[PDB]
Amino acid sequence: AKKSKIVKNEQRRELVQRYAERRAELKRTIRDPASSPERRAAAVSALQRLPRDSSPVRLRNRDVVDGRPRGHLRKFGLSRVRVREMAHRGELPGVRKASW
Amino acid sequence: ARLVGVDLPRDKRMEIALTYIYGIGRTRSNEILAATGIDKNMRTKDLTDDQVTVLRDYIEGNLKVEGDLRREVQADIRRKIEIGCYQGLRHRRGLPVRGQRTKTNARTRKGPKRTI
Amino acid sequence: PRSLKKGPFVDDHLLKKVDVQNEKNTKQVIKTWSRRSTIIPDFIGHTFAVHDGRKHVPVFVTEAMVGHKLGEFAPTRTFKGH
Amino acid sequence: PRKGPAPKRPLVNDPVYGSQLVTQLVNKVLLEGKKSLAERIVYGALEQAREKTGTDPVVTLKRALDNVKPALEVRSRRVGGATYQVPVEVRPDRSTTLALRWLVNFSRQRREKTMVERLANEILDASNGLGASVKRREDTHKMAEANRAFAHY
Amino acid sequence: GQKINPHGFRLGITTEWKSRWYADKQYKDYVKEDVAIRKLLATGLERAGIADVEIERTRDRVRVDIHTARPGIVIGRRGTEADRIRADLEKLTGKQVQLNILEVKNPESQAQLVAQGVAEQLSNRVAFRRAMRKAIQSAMRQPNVKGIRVQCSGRLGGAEMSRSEFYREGRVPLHTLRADIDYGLYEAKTTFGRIGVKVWIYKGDIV
Amino acid sequence: QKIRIRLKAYDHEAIDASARKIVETVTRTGASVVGPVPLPTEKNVYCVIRSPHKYKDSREHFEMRTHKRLIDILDPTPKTVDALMRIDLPASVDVNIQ
Amino acid sequence: PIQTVGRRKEAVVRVRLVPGTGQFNLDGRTLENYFPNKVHQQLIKAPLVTVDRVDQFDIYAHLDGGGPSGQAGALRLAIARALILVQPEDRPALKKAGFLTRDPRAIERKKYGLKKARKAPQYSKR
Amino acid sequence: MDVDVSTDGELPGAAEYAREKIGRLSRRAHRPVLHARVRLTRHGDPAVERPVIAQANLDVNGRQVRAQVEGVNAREAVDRLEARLRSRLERIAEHWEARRGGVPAEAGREWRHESEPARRPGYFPR
RNA sequence: ACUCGUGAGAGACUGCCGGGGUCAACUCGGAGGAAGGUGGGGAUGACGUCAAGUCAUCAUGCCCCUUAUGUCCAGGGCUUCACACAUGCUACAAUGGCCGGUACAAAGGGCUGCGAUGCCGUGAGGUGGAGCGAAUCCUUUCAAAGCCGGUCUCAGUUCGGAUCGGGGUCUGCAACUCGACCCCGUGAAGUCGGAGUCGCUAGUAAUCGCAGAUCAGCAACGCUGCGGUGAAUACGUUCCCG
């Protein structure tokens, strides 16, 4: 798509691995049990202070080379346009046209 | 039988007749009939006076129906209007308030179709 | 609506702003951008300039509008008729 | 049907009555593939008819069919760039089909609170010659006769 | 959209997959590294005709086999070309990557090489009729070639109007499944735009 | 004690070749085998649109088929096991040893 | 013993025939607890009727796949096959009735671009 | 006659002119018009000699009538579209006056596809 | 042993018989057979047409921007509504609604995912985590229409569920604009739809449920598949369309 947006997606992923791995997950563990004292702890407020880009909810599965944000397939990490072209060329092992 | 000022249907099973009360649906009628003990499927012309009394005092005790419910709902809508919230002006101009699409549908709030 | 276990959601920015505003008992116009923050009983007197998309519109809180969100009082789309 | 006639489906004889006609009737009343409900409706109507009259139900069903079976029908024909209502003779199979379809429909618009009752009343009056399907046969024969001038082509 | 890609039509019957490995959790990243390898090799080498690139993987070690019509060009006599490709394939996070450079036996019977040659001739100055005729004659001169069709389209000759032209010789049965149709597509770079050249070559059938 | 051998590959011929080769080596080492028990083929289907833009009604279907074979042996003498880690197989077929 | 199978559109029926009375054992349930539909029962017993060997064979059946109608059809085919295995010289009687033919009528595959196997989306010219 | 115009880009006053011109065609249609749509488009490329493209669709009692023209500006395209639509409506008429010359005439003179075949006796005339 | 799963193979070739046939193609009927005459359904789309669509998958000639038409961020918008068109879903009910009991599928998915037993809620759900990279465990042991029993009695109704009031759950940094779901209440239009028009020839139409991709959640009634129950009709090419 756009080079800047392809890059920014990756930057979100490295931000996610750096922050969402433990910082943005221990706060969730605090909020889960009503027994846990969340209200004074401000685990909500502390987790607000974290960057938005820490949250995986901001991620977007784009095509691994093409950058296409829609028509994505999780098995291949490829757009529907690219999967069709590489399967036809025999590039994805064990993939072929269907009949039944 | 005049129940809370509501003329009951001439011949209906009890819970569905009780549905005719403005504050009662099918769940409420079922549970109140179970709780106060009057049988659920007996017709509306078989009530005794004491049965009407027990329905009356129970409903007046642990339920709100008829005029009070209507005026409380009206008050809620009006208070929602006068604070200027989004639902407020949505009520003011007769448009759907729960995010429904208005490009094509929403004739229920818009009323009958008009040509212009 | 938000679940009760999590509690109401207020952004830290305007939360801190209102704590420092009410500690000396005068309410100046507070300029905010967080339409997603709900209204707390700590806002009863303060006047908020909530963002709209183009500008900030003054919102004076009362007892009734507690529990709502600031965005409910800053209408975004403008329609006058055809 | 451009390349010739198509084969017909040989539907089976009914088990509890042993007649082709009742299976044809159940397939006519069938809706959405609920065959069991259709069979229940037809069997109930036949039993109601047997109770009311007191004899075999298939014989009265056949009597009703003969009472509502048409013989002459009208089809629009375009000969020499002009269309007219031409009376045409009806083959036996099409007559049975028309009679059954008329019976089922006119029972569907009866007012007997249940399809089994409506069907039973319709078949009984058709047996006695008072049904609305009998009437419909009367008007179709009347229309075929009134256009007899066009039968020459 | 008229004709499906001939390789994909016979993928499970006549032709074979160009990538051989098995992955369940790591299918996606395997695919990513494979396409990265392919694009790297496509960009780096253009002089020698790169007819095909195969990738084989097994745990840590990665085996990449490529077929070229000029193996000496892509290989370093002291390994300099080999050193460069090895190092920048290690940099592709391939762990242990080893290369088997190969050579095609009949360059004129290979569709990809034929299309590459035709497009290269088209790019500089050559009239397209000359290129197609020369390619067709050279391919038909080979023993196993039973039929070749060459088609190129675009602003041929720098014209303002796009055109499609094709010549065929012999038999090219695209609808027959058992017949092996070698298909090659490659784009010619001209000053007036991009010209696409497609080649179909038919050499008997495999049963 | 017996150990399970599981084979999974996208090509039926290759998985059959691996199965027969494994049976051959284990019977060379003097072991009892249960044979290449077939297992249901796994089918993963994908449907895509042919054209880059619009033209939704034209779709293309692809599958990914996985064939599974089961090898079970007995009397695990150390020679058989050592032979088992010393078998070369096509990169297409993977082996699961349990 | 003798054992055959009947298949009818994703319904598979295994049958075990023994020369006892007319007892129908369908996975531990009788012909009445199973198949509570008279047409299905007639469809089941038709091969016996044409062979006139009713109430002289105890029948044990395994049912799996499909619905009641497919199960009944597969069971009828299984019974016909069992009869052809027991008394071969009755083959014309069963075959001319068609009970020896597997019905090759399966759910047609759904096609892309169409709502159903054949039903097409509504198209508006205006 | 009500017409809806779906233009695009820049075409000021094209919608009003197109509506006023097309709406005058209702009287020419011999059957009631159920719908009428017009689309105005312009070509981005300045090299195109006739950039503006006008299309129309009328539902004349279920019969679809459509036309398409090209022009150098909105007015010319709309006028040419009106001419084309009028020609199509003339050719569509299908009332009696429009099919009185095609109805087969005479008895033996002239032959047509729908002409009445001659009646022939069983025996050869001789 | 019988199913089944998956490898190999056999099996339909007008092969045979009788009749039409130019003794030619071809055609009609019969036997055998699971299947009979390209068995059923797929994949496969000639030269070209329509300067058809796509410079927004991608690539690219030329032109243009380059302290911006690049680039980062918050908020908003893409969801606006007097209307018009199009594709669908739900209904207008008794061949039905509600309640209780009860029987039969296929296909597919699952690792920081599926998630069971148990316990707590009325219910979304909460706690908890058995076992599962899975013909094993979970999706409940898998369905709904179906069958049996009871009730409703032709009414804008025990039909229909829109809209609206209040209260919650879950995901998520965050459900105001602008999510889904649950509970109580509310109970609109709608009585089978003009001109006109659409799909479908058999396991088809109609109807019933299940699954998948995308996906933190979902606007999914959409799309792609799977199985259950399963019709009517074709006289025949004058007319309409290609």
From Swiss-Prot, chain A:
Keywords: Ribonucleoprotein, Ribosomal protein, RNA-binding, rRNA-binding
Statement: the UniProt record of this protein carries the keyword RNA-binding: yes
Keyword Cytoplasm: no
Coiled-coil segments on the chain, per record: none
GO MF annotation, one: structural constituent of ribosome
Gene3D superfamilies assigned: 1.10.287.1480
Protein origin, superkingdom: Bacteria
Signal peptide range: none
GO terms, biological process: translation
Pfam families (UniProt xref): Ribosomal_S14 (PF00253)
Family: Belongs to the universal ribosomal protein uS14 family.
NCBIfam families: PRK08881.1
Task of the protein: Binds 16S rRNA, required for the assembly of 30S particles and may also be responsible for determining the conformation of the 16S rRNA at the A site.
Subunit comment: Part of the 30S ribosomal subunit. Contacts proteins S3 and S10.
HAMAP family with a match to the protein in the record: Ribosomal_uS14_1 (MF_00537)
Protein name (record): Small ribosomal subunit protein uS14A
Organism annotation: Mycolicibacterium smegmatis (strain ATCC 700084 / mc(2)155)
Swiss-Prot record, chain C:
Keyword Transferase listed: no
GO CC term (a single one): small ribosomal subunit
GO molecular function: rRNA binding; structural constituent of ribosome
Keywords: Ribonucleoprotein, Ribosomal protein, RNA-binding, rRNA-binding
Superkingdom of source: Bacteria
Cross-referenced PROSITE patterns: RIBOSOMAL_S19
Gene Ontology biological process: ribosomal small subunit assembly; translation
InterPro entries found in the cross-reference section: Ribosomal_uS19 (IPR002222), Ribosomal_uS19_bac-type (IPR005732), Ribosomal_uS19_CS (IPR020934), Ribosomal_uS19_SF (IPR023575)
Gene3D superfamilies: 30s Ribosomal Protein S19, Chain A
Function in brief: Protein S19 forms a complex with S13 that binds strongly to the 16S ribosomal RNA.
Family that this chain belongs to: Belongs to the universal ribosomal protein uS19 family.
Protein name: Small ribosomal subunit protein uS19
Species in which this protein is naturally found: Mycolicibacterium smegmatis (strain ATCC 700084 / mc(2)155) (Mycobacterium smegmatis)
Curated annotation (Swiss-Prot), chain E:
Protein origin, superkingdom: Bacteria
Gene Ontology cellular component list: cytosolic small ribosomal subunit
Keywords from the UniProt entry: Ribonucleoprotein, Ribosomal protein, RNA-binding, rRNA-binding
Transmembrane recorded as keyword: no
Protein's GO biological process: translation
All copies of domain KH type-2, residue ranges: 37-105
GO molecular function: mRNA binding; rRNA binding; structural constituent of ribosome
Protein function: Binds the lower part of the 30S subunit head. Binds mRNA in the 70S ribosome, positioning it for translation.
Homology family: Belongs to the universal ribosomal protein uS3 family.
Quaternary structure and partners: Part of the 30S ribosomal subunit. Forms a tight complex with proteins S10 and S14.
The protein's name in its UniProt record: Small ribosomal subunit protein uS3
Organism listed in the record: Mycolicibacterium smegmatis (strain ATCC 700084 / mc(2)155)
Lineage: Bacteria, Bacillati, Actinomycetota, Actinomycetes, Mycobacteriales
Gene name tied to this protein: rpsC
Included stretch of the parent chain: 2 to 208 of 275
Curated annotation (Swiss-Prot), chain F:
Keywords: Ribonucleoprotein, Ribosomal protein
Pfam family, one: Ribosomal_S10
GO biological process entries: translation
Classification via PROSITE patterns: RIBOSOMAL_S10
Entry's Gene Ontology cellular component terms: ribonucleoprotein complex; ribosome
Origin: domain of life: Bacteria
Any coiled-coil regions, as ranges: none
Molecular function, one GO term: tRNA binding
Keyword Ribosomal protein: yes
Keyword Ribonucleoprotein: yes
InterPro entries: Ribosomal_uS10 (IPR001848), Ribosomal_uS10_CS (IPR018268), Ribosomal_uS10_dom (IPR027486), Ribosomal_uS10_dom_sf (IPR036838)
Family that this chain belongs to: Belongs to the universal ribosomal protein uS10 family.
General function of this protein: Involved in the binding of tRNA to the ribosomes.
Quaternary structure and interacting proteins, as annotated: Part of the 30S ribosomal subunit.
Listed name of the protein: Small ribosomal subunit protein uS10
Species the sequence originates in: Mycolicibacterium smegmatis (strain ATCC 700084 / mc(2)155) (Mycobacterium smegmatis)
